[PDB]
């Protein structure tokens, strides 16, 4: 609703060719703050955002210890998953998983998550009520009772409702000014000379945060879809994000167009128009 | 902060 925190897991078995490899990344909204790579002789959780560095030794050890155990466990999980699907040792397989907690504009838990995939496909995920599971197939059903029997739900719920939000709130206060900065876009629109027909009008949105933004071109308050070429949102490499829609349609009367781009970094929805 | 997995938490 407002802020969120997720963790991402991969457990990849190298085609019959060795022990599996466990990775974990910590996300707050879109900022990445910790990473953990199984592959090394002295694996350890590492900072990724400046505001996590202040955290103490015991915290880094609690992380390192869980991802170190997860490493061990997920190998046995990979051995059980492949066993279900009668896959051979060689043998390139992957289980990914993302859980976390959602904060509203107030600062309380809106909902939590614990989904899984195996080999890129939805497997088992926690229902909104934080009590029930959803299995993909008869195999993910085998995993569901494994998990009901161990009451995993009741404990993910205790983490979601408790610790998770707890820490979210914590980081939030610590990395505020970057986490609660909300930077607006430097917008404009341009065109190249040698195009198909008329100006290659390009609606731009740059250096903004977070990623939430909306473009759409109009014919005096309109919604095109078919007449505008849109592009997906990318990072600027420096925490900021980018995105553009555009128009190069065969008809061009030049000065008579709008591009309503609204974002939580604006005091109002922007109307835009360029002058040579 | 990462949740910790208890025993018998495998797939």
């Amino acid at each position: 609703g407002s802020h969120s925190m997720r963790y991402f897991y991969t457990a990849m078995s190298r085609p019959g060719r060795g022990e599996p490899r466990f990775i974990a990344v910590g996300y707050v909204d879109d900022t990445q703050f910790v990473r953990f790579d199984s592959d090394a002789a002295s694996p350890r959780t590492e900072p990724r955002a400046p505001w996590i560095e202040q955290e103490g030794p015991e915290y880094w050890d609690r992380n390192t210890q869980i991802f170190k155990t997860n490493t061990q466990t997920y190998r046995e999980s990979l051995r059980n998953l492949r066993g279900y699907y009668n896959q051979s040792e060689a043998g390139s397989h992957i289980i990914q998983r993302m859980y976390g907690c959602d904060l509203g504009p107030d600062g309380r838990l809106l909902r939590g998550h614990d989904q899984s995939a195996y080999d890129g496909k939805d497997y088992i995920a926690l229902n909104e009520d934080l009590s029930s599971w959803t299995a993909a197939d008869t195999a993910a059903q085998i995993t569901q009772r494994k998990w009901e029997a161990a009451r995993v739900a009741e404990q993910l719920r205790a983490y979601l409702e408790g610790l998770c939000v707890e820490w979210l709130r914590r980081y939030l206060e610590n990395g505020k000014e970057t986490l609660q900065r909300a930077d607006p876009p430097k917008t404009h629109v341009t065109h190249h000379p040698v195009s198909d027909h008329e100006a290659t009008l390009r609606c731009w949105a740059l250096g903004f945060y977070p990623a939430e933004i909306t473009l759409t071109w109009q014919r005096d308050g309109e919604d095109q879809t078919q007449d505008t070429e849109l592009v997906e949102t990318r990072p600027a490499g420096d925490r900021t994000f980018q995105k553009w829609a555009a128009v190069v349609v065969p008809s061009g009367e030049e000065q008579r167009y709008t591009c309503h781009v609204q974002h939580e970094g604006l005091p109002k929805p922007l109307t835009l128009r360029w002058e040579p | 902060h990462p949740v910790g997995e208890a025993d018998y938490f495998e797939y």
Partner: T-cell receptor, first 112, second 110 residues
């Protein structure tokens, strides 16, 4: 009579000695949690195994060691005994919901 | 990291009383109350999971708060003579390990 099976219940040995406490988990439990309670002190977590397979490490000493064998039974070995080793060692078998089912403990008396 | 309050406890048969247990934890996986007699190893009485949870049970009632748990014994009979243990689990560590309190030694004068 929980399910865990500890032996030997009583051991008496000389300093600088070695002994080894057995333990068998509740049928159907795969873990083994070793504990030490020093007469009139608290229960301190020692070490813990899952299926193989060393799963956690409390405050076992450089000098003590243990394993969990193929079946599931554990063996904790206590080398170079000191007088202040004398105590009760409680093995436990977790699961699945997952309470810890303890054994009848085995009492170690180490003498000069 | 788990302390139990009345270390020693000395009650007349019939005299109710609540044994305290404090806890500091990252996130609480579980709180357990065990009963230990001399010689034998800890028996299971209760698990409590969420702040506000209570469990039966016979003369013993168990209670959980944010900061601690309470085992209220009603009308203690002499055979309730044992030392009583308190243990937590924590969502911040993997596995099922317990950290135990020191223990409350209860003696019911008949």
């Amino acid at each position: 009579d929980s399910g865990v099976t500890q032996t030997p219940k009583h051991l008496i040995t000389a300093t600088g000695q070695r002994v080894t406490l057995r333990c068998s988990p509740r049928s159907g439990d795969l873990s083994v949690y070793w504990y030490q309670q020093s007469l009139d002190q608290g229960l301190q977590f020692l070490i813990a195994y899952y299926n193989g397979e060393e799963r956690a490490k409390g405050n076992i000493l450089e000098r003590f060691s243990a394993q969990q064998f193929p079946d599931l039974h554990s063996e904790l070995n206590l080398s170079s005994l000191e007088l202040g080793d004398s105590a009760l060692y409680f093995c436990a078998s977790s699961a699945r919901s997952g309470e810890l089912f303890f054994g009848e403990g085995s009492r170690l008396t180490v003498l000069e | 990291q788990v302390t139990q309050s009345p270390e020693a406890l000395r009650l007349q048969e019939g005299e109710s009383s609540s044994l305290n247990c404090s806890y500091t934890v990252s996130g609480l996986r579980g709180l357990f109350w065990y009963r230990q007699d001399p010689g034998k190893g800890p028996e299971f009485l209760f698990t409590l999971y969420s702040a506000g949870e209570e469990k039966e049970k016979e003369r013993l009632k168990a209670t959980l708060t944010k900061k601690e748990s309470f085992l209220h014994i009603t009308a203690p009979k002499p055979e309730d003579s044992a030392t009583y243990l308190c243990a937590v689990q924590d969502l911040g560590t993997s596995g099922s390990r317990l950290t135990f309190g020191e223990g409350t030694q209860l003696t019911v004068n008949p």
